[PDB]
Symmetry: D2
Subunit: 221 residues, 4 copies
């Protein structure tokens, strides 16, 4: 239908979560261009700071409506508004650390609202996360498809570590629309790149940016 | 002057969210720490009736209730009266993943458990959302130290109607709250857990568990 | 190089999946610098295969990837002495495959000795029941772990009725000669296709196109 | 008139490759199936000496030698004179991934095993390639039926030099050569395996394993 999505969107996000027995609340004002698949956010930890973990593991939980979609790819995400949609996500890191995240997404005019939740367990004390040895998320490629009838995305992720070592994480998100009638898209790919643009010593304030582009792979891309 | 007594009470509240259905469950239990045997009556206070298999939360309803033999260090009875806390991951073969955690404390003859539980990515047509589970099969927990921390891994299996099984890998880390508590060597904990009875919609459940720690073959 | 812009390809695989043994020969031709290669495969032994042919197909040389100038090309750098890989394919339903290929080049031809071993596919899975359609296009991630080039992939077989069958690959790349320069983190896009086949895939014509890039926001 | 005797011989030859290194290990030993014990002296005919920890081949060297109680259907002993076969995947925590196979048959009082074994992606600096393993810890195989086939999953751990552990998940699929043989229901199989003896190079090795099957708690 007609979406309600206009090319400059405000972004309003709200995260509550616990890693390793440590609670934190974080807020973010942000703005974006859904149709260019770009956005940036100003996160500010409202409780639980300084976080004793790496802020990087939180970042992808900070909306694939901001994915530049070609018209030969069904945009399950933009066609899900006004009503909106919600995702669930597991992150499984290679040292048995595992997070689950939920984000539920609505729209009040020029603004997306995100009630996000984040939980992480089993991070080992001398690992990259708890010792905060992380540098950035490398550029990834999300594999999009339908299983048991739900748009699913899997990703093979890797965090750059000091020493230019890499820390592997597997990602699986399930997206569900709030409204009936949303066409399921054929299998596709979504390149992204996420980025901490600026940040203070303790990470209590953070500038985040993301660029996500959908494509069919080779070749034709 | 022991912190652990032969007949103990168990007081628990869990709060969780699986597939986005919120819930709070409360349990009122009794145990025999030295016999590794305990039972519990749980009543759902919010979220009833639960739209997923009650079974998935049951191991998240305390290893002080294991019978430990003298030749295996008993970390959990050693962690009291101050307490301890576990974090747990449950990874289901169909994408089902839960994380959970329990902070156990003690007042006199009573354990106080604050428990959380979050489950994502269970399919609509799987054994959990369809409520086809009957019971956790009796299982063996592998206990070992990794990075300063007591850790158990378990190959779990949920028995289903039609008698197929449905697999879960669990990892649990246990952390004493007081310093200095001595880490056990490598060992095994035998478990069996059961819903003795329940009301139709699982708003009231009586749970029972039994765990016995051992060293395996060939000394058992 | 001495890797020519038009290479020929000599393949020879020997395999065993679910205790079914097979031997498969393939000869083809390539445009290494364009990142493209097709091959005519023939099952010399153990056919008609009791399982989906697609699972063997990535087992049928990253040297055929278009590498841009800002990315180290480990694979063409490894020649003319060559390189090797072991790979593991972990499928969602417990089915596991491992593969190895030694890749040598004498003259204008690449030679591959390729091994491939599969265990624990369920009797009624998409693999033993032949319900696979094609691999979907993919995107290998290349990084270094413990001084060895590694490429991990989120793979997915398209099946009958458009369902998918997930698979996770890990591949480790080892240059033959010492101290060949390890590349920085990067991606290869892939697309592999059976172009045509006969009834029981005793005869198979394959194509693959790989392009290396450093991801957004550049690619 | 039962096929299996209380004192069998074992003839086993293995062919294998880990990390591009080929090898052949031949074997000769004995054991008591109804007791669930066996032992064998293993000779490296080729590939020797072996770069990698010898322990990772050890479980790949027959559940016939498992002690089953009358209340559990013994799939393996009900497989013979015809015999049975297994496939194995070993998935190590640091990316190392093994797959193995064996066809077990019988000729008189001898079991004959054709063992294949292939490990890939073991990190040059790991305990595997660096040979810092000491032993497998005692374990418990979880036996159940998937798609009509006997499948046992294990939570394995290697003890390494320095009191650390190395984790490995096992999945084995068991298939009789004979039609009809009836599958048991869920059970546990306690294992313990031991290099009893070996030369500095590990080209000659004496092995011992002990298997006992049971219903787990509280029926053990």
């Amino acid at each position: 239908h007609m979406s309600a999505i206009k090319p400059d969107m405000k972004i309003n996000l709200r995260m509550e979560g616990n890693v390793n027995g440590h609670h934190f609340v974080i807020d973010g004002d942000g703005t974006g261009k859904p149709f260019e698949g770009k956005q940036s956010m100003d996160l500010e930890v409202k409780e639980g700071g300084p976080l004793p973990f790496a802020f990087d593991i939180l970042t992808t939980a900070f909306n694939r409506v901001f994915a530049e979609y070609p018209d030969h790819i069904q945009d399950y995400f933009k066609q899900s508004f006004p009503k909106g949609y919600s995702w669930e996500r597991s992150l499984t890191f290679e040292d048995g650390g595992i997070c689950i995240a939920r984000n539920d997404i609505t729209m009040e005019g020029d603004t997306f609202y995100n009630k996000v939740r984040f939980h992480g367990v089993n991070f080992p004390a001398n690992g990259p996360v708890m010792q905060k040895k992380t540098l950035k998320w490398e550029p990834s490629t999300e594999k999009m498809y339908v299983r048991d009838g739900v748009l699913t995305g899997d990703i093979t992720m890797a965090l750059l570590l000091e020493g230019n070592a890499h820390y592997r994480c597997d990602s699986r998100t399930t997206y569900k629309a709030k409204e009936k009638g949303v066409k399921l898209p054929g299998y596709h790919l979504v390149d992204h790149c996420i980025e901490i643009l600026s940040h203070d010593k303790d990470y209590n304030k953070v500038k985040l940016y993301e660029h996500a582009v959908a494509h069919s792979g080779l070749p034709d891309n």
